[PDB]
CSV table of C-alpha atoms and ligand atoms in Angstrom, one decimal:
chain,number,residue,atom,x,y,z
K,2,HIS,CA,106.5,67.3,118.6
K,3,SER,CA,108.5,70.4,117.6
K,4,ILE,CA,111.6,72.5,118.2
K,5,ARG,CA,111.7,74.5,121.5
K,6,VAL,CA,114.5,76.8,122.7
K,7,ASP,CA,114.0,78.9,125.8
K,8,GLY,CA,114.8,82.7,125.8
K,9,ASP,CA,113.8,86.2,126.8
K,10,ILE,CA,112.0,87.0,123.5
K,11,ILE,CA,110.7,83.9,121.7
K,12,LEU,CA,110.4,84.0,117.9
K,13,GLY,CA,108.0,81.7,116.0
K,14,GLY,CA,109.0,79.7,112.9
K,15,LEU,CA,107.1,78.2,110.0
K,16,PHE,CA,108.8,75.9,107.5
K,17,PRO,CA,107.6,73.1,105.1
K,18,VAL,CA,109.6,70.3,106.6
K,19,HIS,CA,107.3,67.7,105.0
K,20,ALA,CA,105.3,67.8,101.7
K,21,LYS,CA,101.5,67.6,101.7
K,22,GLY,CA,100.4,63.9,102.0
K,23,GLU,CA,98.5,62.0,99.3
K,24,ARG,CA,94.7,62.2,99.3
K,25,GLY,CA,93.9,61.5,103.0
K,26,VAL,CA,97.1,61.9,105.1
K,27,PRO,CA,98.1,65.4,106.2
K,28,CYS,CA,101.9,65.0,106.0
K,29,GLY,CA,104.0,63.1,103.4
K,30,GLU,CA,107.7,62.9,102.4
K,31,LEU,CA,110.4,65.0,104.0
K,32,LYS,CA,111.5,68.2,102.1
K,33,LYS,CA,115.3,68.1,102.6
K,34,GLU,CA,116.1,71.4,100.9
K,35,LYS,CA,112.8,73.3,101.2
K,36,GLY,CA,112.4,72.2,104.9
K,37,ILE,CA,115.5,71.3,106.8
K,38,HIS,CA,118.0,73.8,105.1
K,39,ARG,CA,115.6,76.8,105.8
K,40,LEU,CA,114.7,75.6,109.3
K,41,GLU,CA,118.4,75.2,110.3
K,42,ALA,CA,119.1,78.6,108.8
K,43,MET,CA,116.8,80.2,111.4
K,44,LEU,CA,118.6,78.2,114.1
K,45,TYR,CA,122.0,79.4,112.7
K,46,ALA,CA,120.8,83.1,112.6
K,47,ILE,CA,119.4,82.9,116.2
K,48,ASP,CA,122.7,81.4,117.5
K,49,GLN,CA,124.6,84.2,115.7
K,50,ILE,CA,122.5,86.9,117.4
K,51,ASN,CA,123.1,85.3,120.8
K,52,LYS,CA,126.9,85.1,119.9
K,53,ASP,CA,126.9,88.8,118.9
K,54,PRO,CA,127.2,91.1,122.0
K,55,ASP,CA,126.3,94.2,120.1
K,56,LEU,CA,122.8,93.1,118.9
K,57,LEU,CA,120.5,92.5,121.9
K,58,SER,CA,123.1,92.9,124.7
K,59,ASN,CA,122.4,90.2,127.4
K,60,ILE,CA,119.0,89.4,125.7
K,61,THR,CA,118.6,85.9,124.2
K,62,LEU,CA,116.2,85.0,121.4
K,63,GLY,CA,114.0,81.9,121.7
K,64,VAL,CA,112.8,79.4,119.1
K,65,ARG,CA,109.4,77.8,118.4
K,66,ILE,CA,109.6,76.3,114.9
K,67,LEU,CA,106.5,74.4,113.6
K,68,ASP,CA,105.9,72.2,110.5
K,69,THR,CA,103.4,73.6,108.0
K,70,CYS,CA,103.3,70.3,106.1
K,71,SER,CA,103.0,72.3,102.8
K,72,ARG,CA,99.3,73.0,103.4
K,73,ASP,CA,97.5,76.0,104.8
K,74,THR,CA,95.0,74.0,106.9
K,75,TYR,CA,97.7,72.3,108.9
K,76,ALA,CA,99.7,75.6,109.3
K,77,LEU,CA,96.5,77.3,110.7
K,78,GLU,CA,96.2,74.6,113.3
K,79,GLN,CA,99.9,74.9,114.2
K,80,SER,CA,99.5,78.7,114.3
K,81,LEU,CA,97.2,78.5,117.4
K,82,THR,CA,100.3,77.3,119.4
K,83,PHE,CA,101.6,80.9,119.2
K,84,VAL,CA,98.4,82.4,120.7
K,85,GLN,CA,97.8,79.8,123.5
K,86,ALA,CA,99.4,82.2,126.0
K,87,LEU,CA,96.0,84.1,126.2
K,88,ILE,CA,93.3,82.1,128.0
K,89,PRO,CA,103.0,79.1,128.5
K,90,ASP,CA,105.1,80.6,125.7
K,91,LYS,CA,104.6,84.2,124.5
K,92,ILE,CA,105.5,84.8,120.8
K,93,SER,CA,106.5,88.3,119.6
K,94,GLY,CA,107.0,87.6,115.9
K,95,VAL,CA,106.7,84.7,113.5
K,96,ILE,CA,109.1,83.9,110.6
K,97,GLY,CA,107.4,82.1,107.7
K,98,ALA,CA,105.9,80.5,105.8
K,99,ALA,CA,107.2,79.4,102.3
K,100,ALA,CA,104.1,79.0,100.1
K,101,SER,CA,101.8,82.0,99.5
K,102,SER,CA,98.5,80.2,100.2
K,103,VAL,CA,100.1,78.9,103.4
K,104,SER,CA,101.3,82.4,104.4
K,105,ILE,CA,97.8,83.9,103.6
K,106,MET,CA,95.9,81.7,106.1
K,107,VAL,CA,98.6,82.3,108.7
K,108,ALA,CA,98.4,86.1,108.1
K,109,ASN,CA,94.6,86.1,108.7
K,110,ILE,CA,95.0,84.5,112.2
K,111,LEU,CA,98.2,86.5,113.2
K,112,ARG,CA,96.7,89.9,112.3
K,113,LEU,CA,93.8,89.5,114.8
K,114,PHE,CA,96.1,88.6,117.7
K,115,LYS,CA,98.5,91.5,116.6
K,116,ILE,CA,101.6,89.4,115.8
K,117,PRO,CA,104.0,90.6,113.0
K,118,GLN,CA,104.9,88.0,110.3
K,119,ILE,CA,108.0,88.1,108.0
K,120,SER,CA,108.1,85.6,105.1
K,121,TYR,CA,111.2,84.4,103.2
K,122,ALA,CA,109.5,83.0,100.1
K,123,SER,CA,105.9,84.1,99.8
K,124,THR,CA,105.6,86.5,96.8
K,125,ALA,CA,101.8,86.9,96.1
K,126,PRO,CA,100.6,90.5,95.4
K,127,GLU,CA,97.6,89.9,97.7
K,128,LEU,CA,99.9,89.9,100.8
K,129,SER,CA,101.0,93.5,100.1
K,130,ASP,CA,97.4,94.8,100.9
K,131,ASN,CA,97.4,96.5,104.3
K,132,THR,CA,93.6,96.0,104.6
K,133,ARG,CA,93.5,92.1,104.4
K,134,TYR,CA,96.9,91.2,106.0
K,135,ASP,CA,98.1,94.4,107.9
K,136,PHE,CA,100.6,92.5,110.0
K,137,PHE,CA,102.4,90.9,107.1
K,138,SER,CA,105.9,91.7,105.9
K,139,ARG,CA,108.4,90.0,103.5
K,140,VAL,CA,112.1,90.2,102.7
K,141,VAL,CA,111.3,88.9,99.2
K,142,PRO,CA,109.8,91.2,96.5
K,143,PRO,CA,106.1,90.9,95.6
K,144,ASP,CA,105.0,89.4,92.2
K,145,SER,CA,103.9,92.9,91.1
K,146,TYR,CA,107.6,93.7,90.4
K,147,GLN,CA,108.2,90.2,88.8
K,148,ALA,CA,105.2,90.7,86.5
K,149,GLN,CA,106.4,94.2,85.6
K,150,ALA,CA,109.9,92.6,84.9
K,151,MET,CA,108.1,90.0,82.7
K,152,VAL,CA,106.2,92.7,80.8
K,153,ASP,CA,109.5,94.6,80.4
K,154,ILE,CA,111.3,91.5,79.0
K,155,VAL,CA,108.4,90.7,76.6
K,156,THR,CA,108.2,94.3,75.3
K,157,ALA,CA,112.0,94.5,74.8
K,158,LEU,CA,111.9,91.4,72.6
K,159,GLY,CA,108.8,92.7,70.7
K,160,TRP,CA,106.5,90.0,71.8
K,161,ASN,CA,103.0,91.7,71.6
K,162,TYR,CA,101.0,88.4,71.5
K,163,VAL,CA,101.5,86.0,74.5
K,164,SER,CA,99.8,83.1,76.4
K,165,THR,CA,99.8,82.5,80.2
K,166,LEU,CA,99.9,79.3,82.3
K,167,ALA,CA,99.0,79.1,86.0
K,168,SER,CA,99.2,76.5,88.8
K,169,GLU,CA,96.2,76.1,91.1
K,170,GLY,CA,96.6,78.2,94.3
K,171,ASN,CA,97.3,81.8,95.3
K,172,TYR,CA,100.9,82.0,93.9
K,173,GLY,CA,100.0,80.7,90.4
K,174,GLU,CA,96.7,82.5,89.8
K,175,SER,CA,97.5,86.0,91.3
K,176,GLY,CA,100.9,86.0,89.7
K,177,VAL,CA,99.4,85.5,86.2
K,178,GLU,CA,96.6,88.1,87.2
K,179,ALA,CA,99.4,90.6,88.1
K,180,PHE,CA,100.8,90.0,84.6
K,181,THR,CA,97.3,90.4,83.1
K,182,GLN,CA,96.7,93.7,84.9
K,183,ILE,CA,100.0,95.3,83.8
K,184,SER,CA,99.4,94.0,80.2
K,185,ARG,CA,95.7,95.2,80.0
K,186,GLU,CA,96.0,98.7,81.6
K,187,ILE,CA,99.5,99.7,80.5
K,188,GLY,CA,101.1,99.4,77.1
K,189,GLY,CA,100.0,96.9,74.3
K,190,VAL,CA,100.5,93.3,75.4
K,191,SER,CA,97.7,90.9,74.3
K,192,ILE,CA,96.9,87.7,76.2
K,193,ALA,CA,95.7,84.9,73.9
K,194,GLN,CA,94.7,82.3,76.5
K,195,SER,CA,95.1,81.8,80.3
K,196,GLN,CA,95.2,78.0,81.0
K,197,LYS,CA,95.0,76.7,84.6
K,198,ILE,CA,96.6,73.5,86.0
K,199,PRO,CA,94.6,71.8,88.7
K,200,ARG,CA,96.2,71.0,92.2
K,201,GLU,CA,95.7,67.2,91.7
K,202,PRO,CA,95.9,66.8,87.9
K,203,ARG,CA,94.6,63.8,85.9
K,204,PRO,CA,97.2,61.7,83.9
K,205,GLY,CA,95.8,63.1,80.6
K,206,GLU,CA,95.6,66.8,81.7
K,207,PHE,CA,99.1,68.0,80.6
K,208,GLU,CA,98.6,66.7,77.1
K,209,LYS,CA,95.3,68.6,76.9
K,210,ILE,CA,97.0,71.8,78.1
K,211,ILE,CA,99.6,71.7,75.2
K,212,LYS,CA,96.8,71.0,72.7
K,213,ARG,CA,94.8,74.0,74.0
K,214,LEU,CA,97.9,76.2,73.8
K,215,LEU,CA,98.4,75.1,70.1
K,216,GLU,CA,94.9,76.4,69.2
K,217,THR,CA,96.5,79.9,69.1
K,218,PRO,CA,99.7,78.8,67.3
K,219,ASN,CA,101.2,82.3,66.8
K,220,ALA,CA,101.2,82.8,70.6
K,221,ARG,CA,104.6,81.1,71.1
K,222,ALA,CA,105.7,82.8,74.3
K,223,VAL,CA,104.3,81.2,77.5
K,224,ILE,CA,104.4,83.2,80.7
K,225,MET,CA,104.1,80.7,83.6
K,226,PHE,CA,103.7,80.7,87.4
K,227,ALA,CA,103.8,76.9,87.9
K,228,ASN,CA,105.4,74.8,90.6
K,229,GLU,CA,108.4,72.5,90.2
K,230,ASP,CA,106.3,69.3,89.6
K,231,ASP,CA,104.1,71.1,87.1
K,232,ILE,CA,106.8,72.6,84.8
K,233,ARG,CA,108.4,69.1,84.7
K,234,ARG,CA,105.1,67.7,83.3
K,235,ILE,CA,104.3,70.5,80.8
K,236,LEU,CA,107.7,70.2,79.2
K,237,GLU,CA,107.3,66.4,79.3
K,238,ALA,CA,104.0,66.7,77.4
K,239,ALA,CA,105.4,69.3,75.0
K,240,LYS,CA,108.3,66.9,74.1
K,241,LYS,CA,105.8,64.0,73.5
K,242,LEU,CA,103.7,66.1,71.0
K,243,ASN,CA,106.9,66.9,68.9
K,244,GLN,CA,106.7,70.6,69.9
K,245,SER,CA,110.5,71.2,70.1
K,246,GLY,CA,111.5,74.8,69.3
K,247,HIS,CA,107.9,76.1,69.0
K,248,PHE,CA,107.2,77.3,72.6
K,249,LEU,CA,109.3,80.1,74.1
K,250,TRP,CA,109.1,79.5,77.9
K,251,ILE,CA,109.0,82.4,80.4
K,252,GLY,CA,109.3,81.2,84.1
K,253,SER,CA,109.0,82.8,87.5
K,254,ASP,CA,110.9,82.2,90.8
K,255,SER,CA,109.4,78.8,91.1
K,256,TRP,CA,111.2,77.8,87.9
K,257,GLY,CA,114.4,79.9,88.7
K,258,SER,CA,117.6,78.0,88.0
K,259,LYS,CA,116.2,74.6,89.1
K,260,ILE,CA,117.8,71.6,87.2
K,261,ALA,CA,114.8,69.3,88.2
K,262,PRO,CA,112.2,70.3,85.6
K,263,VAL,CA,114.8,70.5,82.7
K,264,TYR,CA,116.7,67.2,83.4
K,265,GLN,CA,116.5,64.7,80.5
K,266,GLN,CA,114.4,67.4,78.8
K,267,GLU,CA,117.2,69.7,77.6
K,268,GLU,CA,116.0,70.1,74.0
K,269,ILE,CA,112.4,71.2,74.9
K,270,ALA,CA,113.7,73.6,77.7
K,271,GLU,CA,116.1,75.4,75.3
K,272,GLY,CA,116.1,79.3,75.4
K,273,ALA,CA,113.8,79.5,78.4
K,274,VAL,CA,113.9,82.9,80.1
K,275,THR,CA,113.5,82.8,83.9
K,276,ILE,CA,113.4,85.4,86.7
K,277,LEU,CA,114.6,85.0,90.3
K,278,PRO,CA,115.1,87.5,93.2
K,279,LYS,CA,118.7,88.7,93.8
K,280,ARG,CA,120.5,86.2,96.0
K,281,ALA,CA,124.0,84.9,97.2
K,282,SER,CA,125.4,81.8,98.9
K,283,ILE,CA,126.4,82.1,102.6
K,284,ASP,CA,129.6,80.3,103.6
K,285,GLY,CA,128.8,80.9,107.3
K,286,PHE,CA,125.7,78.7,107.2
K,287,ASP,CA,127.6,76.2,105.0
K,288,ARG,CA,130.3,75.8,107.7
K,289,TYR,CA,127.5,75.4,110.3
K,290,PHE,CA,125.4,72.8,108.4
K,291,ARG,CA,128.4,70.6,107.3
K,292,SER,CA,129.5,70.3,111.0
K,293,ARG,CA,126.0,69.0,112.1
K,294,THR,CA,126.0,65.6,113.7
K,295,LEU,CA,123.4,63.5,115.4
K,296,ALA,CA,125.2,64.2,118.7
K,297,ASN,CA,125.3,68.0,118.6
K,298,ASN,CA,122.1,68.7,116.7
K,299,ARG,CA,119.7,67.0,119.0
K,300,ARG,CA,117.6,70.2,119.3
K,301,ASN,CA,116.3,69.6,115.7
K,302,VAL,CA,113.6,66.9,116.2
K,303,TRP,CA,113.5,66.3,112.4
K,304,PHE,CA,117.3,65.8,112.0
K,305,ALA,CA,117.0,62.1,112.8
K,306,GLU,CA,114.5,61.8,110.0
K,307,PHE,CA,116.8,63.9,107.8
K,308,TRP,CA,119.8,61.6,108.3
K,309,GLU,CA,117.8,58.6,106.8
K,310,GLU,CA,116.6,60.6,103.8
K,311,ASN,CA,120.0,62.3,103.0
K,312,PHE,CA,122.3,59.2,102.9
K,313,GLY,CA,119.8,56.4,102.3
K,314,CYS,CA,120.4,55.5,106.0
K,315,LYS,CA,118.1,53.3,108.2
K,316,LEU,CA,118.0,53.3,112.1
K,317,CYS,CA,123.8,52.3,108.4
K,318,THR,CA,126.7,53.6,110.6
K,319,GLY,CA,125.5,57.0,111.8
K,320,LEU,CA,128.8,58.8,111.4
K,321,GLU,CA,128.5,60.3,107.9
K,322,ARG,CA,129.5,63.8,106.7
K,323,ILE,CA,127.5,66.3,104.7
K,324,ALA,CA,129.2,67.4,101.4
K,325,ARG,CA,131.4,64.3,101.6
K,326,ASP,CA,129.1,61.3,101.5
K,327,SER,CA,126.1,62.9,99.7
K,328,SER,CA,125.8,65.8,97.2
K,329,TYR,CA,125.2,69.2,98.8
K,330,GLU,CA,124.0,72.6,97.7
K,331,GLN,CA,122.8,75.4,99.9
K,332,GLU,CA,119.1,76.2,99.2
K,333,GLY,CA,118.1,79.5,97.5
K,334,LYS,CA,115.8,81.0,100.1
K,335,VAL,CA,118.5,80.6,102.9
K,336,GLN,CA,119.7,84.2,102.5
K,337,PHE,CA,116.2,85.4,102.9
K,338,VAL,CA,115.6,83.2,106.0
K,339,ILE,CA,118.7,84.7,107.8
K,340,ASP,CA,117.7,88.2,106.6
K,341,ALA,CA,114.1,87.7,108.1
K,342,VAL,CA,115.4,86.7,111.5
K,343,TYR,CA,117.9,89.7,111.6
K,344,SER,CA,115.1,92.0,110.5
K,345,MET,CA,113.1,90.9,113.6
K,346,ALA,CA,116.2,91.2,115.8
K,347,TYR,CA,117.1,94.7,114.6
K,348,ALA,CA,113.5,95.9,115.2
K,349,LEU,CA,113.6,94.5,118.8
K,350,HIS,CA,117.0,96.1,119.3
K,351,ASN,CA,115.5,99.5,118.1
K,352,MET,CA,112.5,99.0,120.3
K,353,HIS,CA,114.8,98.4,123.3
K,354,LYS,CA,116.7,101.6,122.5
K,355,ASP,CA,113.4,103.6,122.7
K,356,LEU,CA,111.7,101.8,125.6
K,357,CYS,CA,114.6,100.7,127.8
K,358,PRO,CA,117.2,103.5,127.6
K,359,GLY,CA,120.6,102.9,129.4
K,360,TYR,CA,119.4,99.4,130.3
K,361,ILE,CA,121.1,96.0,130.0
K,362,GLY,CA,118.5,93.2,129.3
K,363,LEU,CA,114.7,93.5,129.3
K,364,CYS,CA,113.1,96.4,131.2
K,365,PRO,CA,109.6,96.1,132.9
K,366,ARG,CA,108.2,98.4,130.2
K,367,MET,CA,109.1,95.6,127.6
K,368,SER,CA,107.5,92.8,129.7
K,369,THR,CA,104.6,92.6,127.1
K,370,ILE,CA,105.8,93.6,123.6
K,371,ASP,CA,103.2,95.4,121.5
K,372,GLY,CA,102.9,93.8,118.1
K,373,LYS,CA,101.3,97.0,116.6
K,374,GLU,CA,104.4,99.0,117.7
K,375,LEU,CA,106.9,96.3,116.7
K,376,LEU,CA,105.4,96.1,113.2
K,377,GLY,CA,106.3,99.8,112.6
K,378,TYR,CA,109.9,99.1,113.8
K,379,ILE,CA,110.3,96.2,111.2
K,380,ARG,CA,109.2,98.5,108.3
K,381,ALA,CA,111.7,101.2,109.3
K,382,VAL,CA,114.7,98.7,109.7
K,383,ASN,CA,117.7,99.2,107.3
K,384,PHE,CA,120.9,97.1,107.5
K,385,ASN,CA,123.4,95.1,105.5
K,386,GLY,CA,122.6,91.4,105.9
K,387,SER,CA,124.2,88.0,105.0
K,388,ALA,CA,125.3,88.8,101.4
K,389,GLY,CA,126.3,92.4,102.3
K,390,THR,CA,123.2,93.6,100.5
K,391,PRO,CA,120.8,96.1,102.1
K,392,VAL,CA,117.5,94.9,103.7
K,393,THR,CA,114.6,97.3,103.6
K,394,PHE,CA,110.8,97.5,103.7
K,395,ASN,CA,108.2,100.0,102.3
K,396,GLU,CA,104.9,101.2,103.9
K,397,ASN,CA,103.1,98.1,102.6
K,398,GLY,CA,105.8,95.7,104.0
K,399,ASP,CA,107.5,94.7,100.7
K,400,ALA,CA,111.1,94.2,99.8
K,401,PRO,CA,112.4,96.2,96.7
K,402,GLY,CA,112.1,94.5,93.3
K,403,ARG,CA,115.7,93.2,92.8
K,404,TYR,CA,115.8,90.3,90.3
K,405,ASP,CA,118.2,88.2,88.2
K,406,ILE,CA,117.3,87.2,84.7
K,407,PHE,CA,118.5,83.8,83.4
K,408,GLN,CA,118.3,81.9,80.1
K,409,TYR,CA,118.7,78.1,79.8
K,410,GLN,CA,121.3,77.5,77.1
K,411,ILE,CA,123.0,74.4,75.5
K,412,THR,CA,126.7,74.6,74.5
K,413,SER,CA,127.1,71.8,78.4
K,414,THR,CA,123.9,73.1,80.1
K,415,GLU,CA,123.7,76.3,82.1
K,416,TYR,CA,121.4,79.1,83.4
K,417,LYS,CA,123.3,82.1,81.9
K,418,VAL,CA,122.8,85.5,83.6
K,419,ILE,CA,121.3,87.4,80.6
K,420,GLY,CA,120.3,90.5,82.7
K,421,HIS,CA,118.7,92.0,85.8
K,422,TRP,CA,115.7,94.0,87.0
K,423,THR,CA,116.0,96.7,89.7
K,424,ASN,CA,113.1,99.2,89.2
K,425,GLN,CA,114.1,99.3,85.5
K,426,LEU,CA,115.0,96.5,83.1
K,427,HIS,CA,118.7,96.0,82.3
K,428,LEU,CA,118.8,93.2,79.8
K,429,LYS,CA,121.7,92.0,77.6
K,430,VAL,CA,119.9,90.8,74.4
K,431,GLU,CA,123.3,90.0,72.8
K,432,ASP,CA,123.9,87.0,75.1
K,433,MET,CA,120.7,85.2,74.2
K,434,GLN,CA,120.5,81.9,72.3
K,435,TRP,CA,117.6,79.9,70.7
K,436,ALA,CA,117.1,76.6,68.8
T,16,HVG,N1,106.8,82.4,95.4
T,16,HVG,C1,106.1,81.1,95.7
T,16,HVG,C2,104.9,81.4,96.6
T,16,HVG,O1,104.4,82.6,96.7
T,16,HVG,O2,104.5,80.4,97.3
T,16,HVG,C3,107.0,80.1,96.2
T,16,HVG,C4,107.1,79.9,97.6
T,16,HVG,C5,107.9,78.9,98.1
T,16,HVG,C6,108.6,78.1,97.3
T,16,HVG,C7,109.5,77.1,97.8
T,16,HVG,O3,108.9,76.5,98.9
T,16,HVG,O4,110.6,76.7,97.4
T,16,HVG,C8,108.5,78.3,95.9
T,16,HVG,C9,109.3,77.4,94.9
T,16,HVG,O5,109.1,76.3,94.7
T,16,HVG,O6,110.3,78.2,94.3
T,16,HVG,C10,107.7,79.3,95.4
T,17,CL,CL1,105.0,76.5,103.6
């Protein structure tokens, strides 16, 4: 009940195609953008490597994409499919997953069987530790650099007294913890209160959060690592308690430039500073995804379920066009998905150069690929990918801290590029606006 493509070297995939089900059920509603767009971006990238004669000459890359269902427990059970070769598909490297807690549980099982793992979205500072998850790499920067950026933004505005808000899980708690560590040890940034939002919150919890935050009234700036559904509800609760203009929101990559938490809540979201990793839209994937029909894209097992959710269809004509019959935007992490697959491909190409010299196709010396060796190749990889931007890794397996800084402004509503963070803060304070 998943995507299989035969090939010489088979690469594993982990994507949240469905959201986590309510109470009992494992899998719920289909994630159209966070699931299908990223899944199809891996299939686009793999097809491009097979098309390219220079990268892996007469060597084809295989696909084994599995659904994580937004939860770590389901992804762990799916992860065992990669290791079922040892008492049949042999998996060299796994691309995924999205969520940090999901990627942590996968990293713990893949390290023992010596399988390298490259993520496209997981940003938790815990994953950069080479003791706990030594086979983990990522094409997205760790939250150590985002928390440093947040400290830099706060200090540049003269905001010595702040409060923090976290969502339950690894991404929310450790992201705030990374901010706390930079604040406590270095400089003079004081934390008033660190409030936590539960995973399954009660109907009256978000109103209690605002009331608790108001107990330290001078702490106006709120640094937050909350999910899309959480931010929506905090700002909804803040608007209800007549707290317009009081709170100065600071959001992470989970907030980014999403219109979802700010919609019909434009007044309360005014002047909110957000940080997001440096990113561009790919027209190549856009041309690929728009030309996807139910006839040609039969290899995607979830594409039939996608067609119903996208147009309001029910299996309806079954001859619709994307970006013509329904509103279409390319997902953010798509650049990082393509750059993750190419990072794996370039490392395999570099391993082929060393182990099979003057050879076309796989040599008998590469019949069983060593994961401990291949991991070192991934870290050493340096190339221009997708956007034309360089893709690189350090010793710990992290991408460099390259960020965009946005502010939500009313003039017309937009996320205006007020600055950027690349090792050091470059922030244009002149372009900022408040209520
Ligand atoms: N950086 C966190 C993390 O570490 O999980 C993260 C991961 C994945 C997603 C996503 O699936 O889109 C988001 C998000 O909602 O922006 C945030
Ligand atoms: Cl995930």
